[PDB]
Amino acid sequence: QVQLAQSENELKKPGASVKVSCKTSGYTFTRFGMSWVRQAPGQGLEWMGWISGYTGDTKYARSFQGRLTLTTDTSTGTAYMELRSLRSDDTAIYYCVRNRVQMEVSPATQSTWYMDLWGRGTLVSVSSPSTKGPSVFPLAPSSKSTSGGTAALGCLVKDYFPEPVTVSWNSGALTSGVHTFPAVLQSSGLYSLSSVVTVPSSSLGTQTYICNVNHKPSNTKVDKKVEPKSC
Amino acid sequence: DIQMTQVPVSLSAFVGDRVSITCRASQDISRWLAWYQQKPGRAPKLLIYAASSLQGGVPSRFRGSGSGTEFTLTISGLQPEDFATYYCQQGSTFPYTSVLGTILGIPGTVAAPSVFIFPPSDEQLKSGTASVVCLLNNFYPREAKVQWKVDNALQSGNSQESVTEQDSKDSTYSLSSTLTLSKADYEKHKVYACEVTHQGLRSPVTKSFNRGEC
Amino acid sequence: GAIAGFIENGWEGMIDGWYGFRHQNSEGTGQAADLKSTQAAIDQINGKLNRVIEKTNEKFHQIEKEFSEVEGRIQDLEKYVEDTKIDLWSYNAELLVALENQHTIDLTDSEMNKLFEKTRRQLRENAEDMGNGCFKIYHKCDNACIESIRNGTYDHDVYRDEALNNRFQI
Amino acid sequence: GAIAGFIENGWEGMIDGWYGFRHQNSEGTGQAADLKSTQAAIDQINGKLNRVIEKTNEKFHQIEKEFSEVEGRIQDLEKYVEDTKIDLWSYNAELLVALENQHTIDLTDSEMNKLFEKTRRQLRENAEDMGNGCFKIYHKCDNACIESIRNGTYDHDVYRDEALNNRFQIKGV
Amino acid sequence: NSTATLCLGHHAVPNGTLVKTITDDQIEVTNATELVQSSSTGKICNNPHRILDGIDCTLIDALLGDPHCDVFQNETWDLFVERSKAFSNCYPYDVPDYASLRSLVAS
Amino acid sequence: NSTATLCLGHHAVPNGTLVKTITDDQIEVTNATELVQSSSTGKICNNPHRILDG
Amino acid sequence: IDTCISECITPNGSIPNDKPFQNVNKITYGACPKYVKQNTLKLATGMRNVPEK
Ligand SMILES: *[C@@H]1O[C@H](CO)[C@@H](O)[C@H](O)[C@H]1NC(C)=O
Ligand SMILES: *[C@@H]1O[C@H](CO)[C@@H](O)[C@H](O)[C@H]1NC(C)=O
Ligand SMILES: *[C@@H]1O[C@H](CO)[C@@H](O)[C@H](O)[C@H]1NC(C)=O
Ligand SMILES: *[C@@H]1O[C@H](CO)[C@@H](O)[C@H](O)[C@H]1NC(C)=O
Ligand SMILES: *[C@@H]1O[C@H](CO)[C@@H](O)[C@H](O)[C@H]1NC(C)=O
Ligand SMILES: *[C@@H]1O[C@H](CO)[C@@H](O)[C@H](O)[C@H]1NC(C)=O
Question: Which residue of F has its CA nearest to B32?
Fold first, then answer.
């Protein structure tokens, strides 16, 4: 089995630099090349550069004229990328991809010529504020028995940084009707998101619903409950 | 550098339909292009290499065509797993270049949104900030207009929306608009409401709430 | 146990690359591959291999090429047209590989000579061409000195006085 | 501000010719084109350009190549014969240009090396190949001396003793 | 010692492949690839082209509507495959310019 | 100066034409000429051939 | 007929289209290699082989 194990997600400030690594497995690191491509949130793919596992020769994109540097360690067989002078725009998920064959003749009619093997990806976040845990708030069902037939309740995960935040309901018991929304960037530079679920109105009084929020960067594990407010 | 141009950018086709995606090159590529599939929340996957060669495990409905500078990807007999974002890539010369890509959505039947309103809780007012949210559940198509109204006072430069990706069975969308103000600003007005406009509704439906009361 | 260069032979025991170096010095013998010249040769072969298999001649409905019965004049023409086509393409195929092979043999021999001249240029007056694809370096060149030649950072002025002394004085 | 030769570099600021010289001496820097080597390369390109266009295929009455209606067996043959013809000529065209281009690139690179060797022959033991397409001339070579190298009248014996002393010295000759 | 030796060389293989050039019929090289396909699996791949097996029917028999060829009514194809075992089982007929009609319908 | 430097070189262009060879699909060259006619005036020349309009 | 994938089809069965030429059959369908009379044409993918080590 062939695998590309990447390094953990990183949080950095404007300026400075990052060094993302990518450990190779199941194939000879030499006799192959490595490409690096990134994807900004909601945007398409952007090719950054390529490096030979055999010769060490590099090919860079015009955008990364002197900001990107690709290096390699033949033994142990791992590949690195270094991006200097970081900006808010550089916030993206960075993929490491096996791309070309080296030390042997191979035509472009082969899958190996193209970007054959992808890594899971590595998120790097460039922002000025420090790591901060989320603030969970209760979202109660309003009005007279909501619509009448179906009801909705939720949890508001507000003010946290950086992404991601995991959320589940009743520790994975309640899945149907659940809608966890993608996070939105605030003016302050912090992230916020909401998670909701549709249930029968009759179940509000009898059934109990718990949202389990997890934020690994700040190590914040919160379990909050919501039911109709006592007016 | 070789600029790649993907034409459809956004696309809607129901299951069992045939759909065509185009990629035109700035220069002669001569067959050496590749197509990639990227499902939401996952990494890209190689679909076909060269002009037409399918990757191992790829069905057969996907058919690649082209040479020189004109290339196309067509998907026949659409299935739910085929709905993703697609990218072509030239491998003729460095620098290698991907594209803007084509997003694939599912057009089912028209479904009106379930509009709900939720006031800010008492824990939130302690922080000194208060947020109002208008929730739209399970609807199609995506283009839906949302406007906030505070005691008949126009809102602008104070709200942000978020949309979910297409879910698995009902094939509809969900949206959440969120308006945020300080405690001081929240204390000035009584009536708060969100007006929604969508193809499923004949008239804009309004869910509202008055402050001080539930 | 003298070492020999590319003129008389090739090196069977060499897996790291296509072209390389072999040395004999104060710290003993050694060997190393030249990776850039190796990949350069391969890149060229990839290029022509790609061109010969570029274009896919996609053909659908064509004329009949086999006949169960004797018809006459039109049949003879159909047979002639195809027989003509095949002979012409068979010629093109025979010629193409011959031209490609000759060129491949030349460009690979060219890479060897370019590497030899690159090295000759580095050593300047500190060495002499023994004629068998080897250089007699006229100064104490330890393993680090050899690597500097291989990675292209050899400074001849450092060893010039020592070398010129060993070359001319008898 | 060292000068560099032809190895992995070209000279953008060059209008008098295709190949040339660039120098650094007592009287400062300078540049000049080599006209004969330039014209020699061009003469060769003219030659092959002439040959590719030397025949004029004059053709008059031919077969029909477009058809308004579906006829049958004869039509299919006429289409096949022409489709075959076009494929064979399209191959010949693709191959010809490839072979001509490769040769043009080789003969132009060859012309550069011939000029380098011609110069190397002139200087004899009065200079050394620095390796970047340049010569280190080991004697005071003013503008007139450079000019003599360029116009092929350089007498090495005149500067031999001066040069050999500068080349082979450990401290004192 | 006071000197050193530096030799330059290229790799070789115990037994290489023979190829042809403009001057030589047989030159040994370290590696080569075949450019002529001479082998077949013996079977026809049902993908990517839509293959239609005629079995006992010919294209014309199917066109006219021979009783045992009724399964081919309104049938479509990319390649129609005609078998040698095929036979006619209707009214005896001839088709002047058979080849043209066969080619026409096939297209 | 007691010494001098003499470099040999060739000219170059800010932007050249791409051509094809036996090994390369795209190699930049200083100059090139088109060998395929792809344009027409849209009109038929009455000379040198005697043309008869039906 | 069999369940598998191949662009080129001949009366002898399907054949791979990886090579530029083929010797199987002048009759073809799809993206096929050009028919030639030769049964073998070897293209050098390496330098000339010399024996000593
Ligand atoms: C010949 O080339 C093929 C393809 O690059 C390679 O797999 C094989 O190992 C090579 N053989 C030799 C002897 O170099
Ligand atoms: C070349 O090798 C020497 C050691 O012999 C080392 O000091 C030097 O840094 C190397 N240069 C490069 C570019 O690898
Ligand atoms: C070459 O140049 C020198 C001056 O540097 C001049 O004296 C000599 O006559 C010239 N020879 C020719 C043939 O032009
Ligand atoms: C392969 O090795 C050499 C290649 O030069 C040849 O002489 C020998 O006969 C061959 N042996 C076999 C067993 O093929
Ligand atoms: C010259 O051509 C390349 C592509 O062939 C182009 O990208 C570049 O911008 C051009 N340079 C100038 C100075 O026009
Ligand atoms: C292909 O089939 C024909 C008969 O149609 C036969 O004559 C020929 O020998 C076969 N060739 C191969 C390579 O199977």
Answer: F25
DSSP character string of C110-140: HHHHHHHHHHHHHHTTSEEE-SSSEEEE-S-
Nearest to C133 among E7, E19, E23 (CB): E7
Q: Quick one: which ligand is closest to E26's CA?
A: 4
Q: How many domains does chain A have?
A: 2
Q: What is the CATH number of the domain that holds D90?
A: 3.90.20.10
Read out DSSP for A176-191? Answer: TTEEEPPPEE-TTS-E
Nearest to A59 among B95, B100, B137 (CB): B95
The amino acid present at E19, given as its one-letter code, is: V
**What is the residue range of D61's domain?**
1-173
Angle, CA D18 vertex, CA D14 and CA D24 arms, to 5° = 55
Are B54 and G5 inside 8 Å of each other by CB? Answer: yes
- Resolution in Å equals 2.8
Q: Which residues pair with C114 in a beta bridge?
A: none
Nearest Cα residue to F36 out of B68, D100, D94: D94
Nearest to D137 by CA among D21, D52, D53, D36: D21
| Fold annotation for B108-214 | Immunoglobulin-like (2.60.40)
C112: left (phi over 0), alpha (psi -120 to 50) or beta: alpha
Cα separation, D119 vs A192, in Å, equals 74
Structure token digits, residue C48:
């022509």
Consecutive H or E run containing A59: strand A58-60
A203 is in which domain, residue-wise?
Answer: 129-231
Ligand 5 geometric centre to CA of B1 (Å):
9
- CATH class label, B1-107: mainly beta
Q: Please report the atom of ligand 3 found closest to the CA of residue D146.
A: 5
Contact status, residue D146 vs residue D23, Cβ threshold 8 Å:
yes
- Which candidate in D78, D81, D96 is best for mutational testing of the C interface (most C CBs within 10 A)? D81
Q: Kindly compute the dihedral angle of the four CA atoms of residues B151, B153, B158, B160, in this order, to the nearest 10 degrees.
A: 70
Count of domains for chain D: 1
